[PDB]
Amino acid sequence: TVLTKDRIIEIIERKTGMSREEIEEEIRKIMEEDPYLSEQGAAALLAERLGIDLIEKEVSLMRISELYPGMDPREVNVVGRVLKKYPPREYTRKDGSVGRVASLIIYDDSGRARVVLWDAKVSEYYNKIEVGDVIKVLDAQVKESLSGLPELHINFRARIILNPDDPRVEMIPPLEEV
Amino acid sequence: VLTKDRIIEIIERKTGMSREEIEEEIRKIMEEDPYLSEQGAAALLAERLGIDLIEKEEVSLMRISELYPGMDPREVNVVGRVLKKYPPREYTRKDGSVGRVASLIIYDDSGRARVVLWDAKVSEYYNKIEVGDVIKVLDAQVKESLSGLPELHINFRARIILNPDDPRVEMIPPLEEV
Ligand SMILES: [Cl-]
Numbered sequence: 001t002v003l004t005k006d007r008i009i010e011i012i013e014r015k016t017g018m019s020r021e022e023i024e025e026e027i028r029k030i031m032e033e034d035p036y037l038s039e040q041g042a043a044a045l046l047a048e049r050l051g052i053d054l055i056e057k058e059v060s061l062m063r064i065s066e067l068y069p070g071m072d073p074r075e076v077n078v079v080g081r082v083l084k085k086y087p088p089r090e091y092t093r094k095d096g097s098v099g100r101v102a103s104l105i106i107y108d109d110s111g112r113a114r115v116v117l118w119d120a121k122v123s124e125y126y127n128k129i130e131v132g133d134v135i136k137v138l139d140a141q142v143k144e145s146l147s148g149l150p151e152l153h154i155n156f157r158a159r160i161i162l163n164p165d166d167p168r169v170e171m172i173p174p175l176e177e178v
Numbered sequence: 179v180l181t182k183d184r185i186i187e188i189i190e191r192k193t194g195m196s197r198e199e200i201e202e203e204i205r206k207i208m209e210e211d212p213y214l215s216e217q218g219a220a221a222l223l224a225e226r227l228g229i230d231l232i233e234k235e236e237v238s239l240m241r242i243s244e245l246y247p248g249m250d251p252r253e254v255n256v257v258g259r260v261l262k263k264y265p266p267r268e269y270t271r272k273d274g275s276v277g278r279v280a281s282l283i284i285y286d287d288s289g290r291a292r293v294v295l296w297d298a299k300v301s302e303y304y305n306k307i308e309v310g311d312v313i314k315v316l317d318a319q320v321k322e323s324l325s326g327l328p329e330l331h332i333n334f335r336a337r338i339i340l341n342p343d344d345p346r347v348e349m350i351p352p353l354e355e356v
Contacts, residue, residue: 017262017283017309026265049265051305084194087203087226105194127228128305131194132341163308 001044001054008043008054011165015052053161055138061168065110067150073139076152079168080106080113081134083178088122102126105149106135107178109171114145118155125160132175136164179233185220191343192229232337234316237344243288245328251317251335257346258284258291259312261356266300280304284313284330285356287349292329293318299332306340310353314342 003011012023023046030042037045047054060077067078088102100122104115115137117126129135138159143151154160180188182204189200200223207219214222224231238255245256266280278300282293293315295304307313318336323329332338 015309016264017260018264022264046265050263082194085227086193086195086199087223130306130340131192 002057003040003044003054005040005043007058008040008047011052011054012043012047012050014165015163016050055136055159055161055164059166063110063168064106064108064113064150067113067142067152069142069144069150071142073141073157076140076142077136077138078108078113078152079134079136079164079166079172080108080115081172081175082106082129082131083112083175085126085129085131088117088126104129106137106152107172108168109173111149113150113152114147115140115152115154117160118153120156121154121158121160125154125162128162134163134169134172136161136166180217180221180231182217182220185217185224185231188229188231189220189224189227193227232316232339235314235339235342239346241288241346242284242286242291242328245291245320245330247320247322247328249320251319254318254320254330255314255316256286256291256330257312257314257342257344257350258286258293259350259353260284260307260309261290261353263304263307263309266295266304282307284315285350286346287351291327292323293332294329295332298334299336299338303332303338303340307338312341312347312350314339314344 009020009023013020026046027039027042030045031037044054062077064078064080082104084105086103088100090098091101092098099119102117102122106113106115137152140152140154140158143153145151186197186200190197203223204219207222208214221231236255240255242256242258260282262283264281266278268276269279271277277297280295280300284291284293315330316337318330318332321329321331
């Protein structure tokens with residue numbers, strides 16, 4: 001990841017509640033264990049051990065209401081709280097094989113979107129996501145759902161960050177308000 | 179042991195699906211397997227959704243201030259908001275093997291407690307928990323901390339419910355007030 005050591009420490013403080021002094025002591029222990037790590041690399045390893053998923057390169061003000069079918073997946077960068085999780089199901093490929101697909105409904109301060117997890121993304125994320133959790137979606141293909149809602153398609157080329165550190169998260173209404 | 183109606187209520191809470199949507203999923207499972215009862219089909223749906231059904235999730239008025247070392251783990255039923263999460267660590271067992279252990283600090287309207295996740299409980303819950311989340315702790319052993327205060331030990335017997343449906347939750351102060 002290209003995130004600086006200070007940015008990683010800021011994310012760790014927000015996600016763990018540890019003081020800066022406690023976090024620095026954890027980084028020192030990691031560096032004492034591995035002399036090849038830089039301070040940034042040690043901070044990234046600490047984030048990983050804490051179950052914090054860091055994006056390789058970080059920002060966007062984009063809202064769900066701004067998504068449109070066929071937009072460049074490189075422009076897709078939205079956050080949303082999970083409102084609904086539907087059961088995973090099987091689908092048949094043109095080659096005759098069977099894959100997996102699972103759908104969720106997420107929302108931000110602007111609207112809702114269906115999020116479609118494909119194949120390994122179901123095994124990778126489906127049980128990790130809970131209703132009320134916030135996800136950040138990157139590099140997803142956008143399709144028009146039969147409903148009208150934008151559809152974010154999460155395949156092996158897309159990225160999901162569970163409970164991201166992002167300024168848009170605080171503007172998403174809580175579940176009770178929806 | 180949980181009734182079909184109780185399983186549907188848990189599925190509604192954990193997925194946000196409507197009762198009508200859940201019933202339709204149970205119908206599909208029953209149409210696939212004629213040997214399942216309605217309760218068995220609801221339990222299979224919960225399992226496919228990644229929901230672990232806790233057979234004893236009773237209500238209690240118990241507070242963290244009422245915990246004492248050596249109290250009956252069957253009486254242990256407390257809720258708390260997560261204030262701090264420390265990194266998972268390795269520890270050495272009496273047999274020479276290496277296990278994992280991770281600690282959190284939680285608090286309710288009455289006080290704070292260290293929560294210690296042992297071995298598979300770290301893999302099972304640690305990444306699912308975040309600061310500000312509320313957890314319900316059941317069947318944990320209570321030990322005296324190095325400062326003479328009660329700590330909750332989450333071993334094989336213990337259970338944790340993430341963001342529980344419990345009347346005590348609304349009484350826990352938000353992070354900003356602490
Ligand atoms: Cl919420």
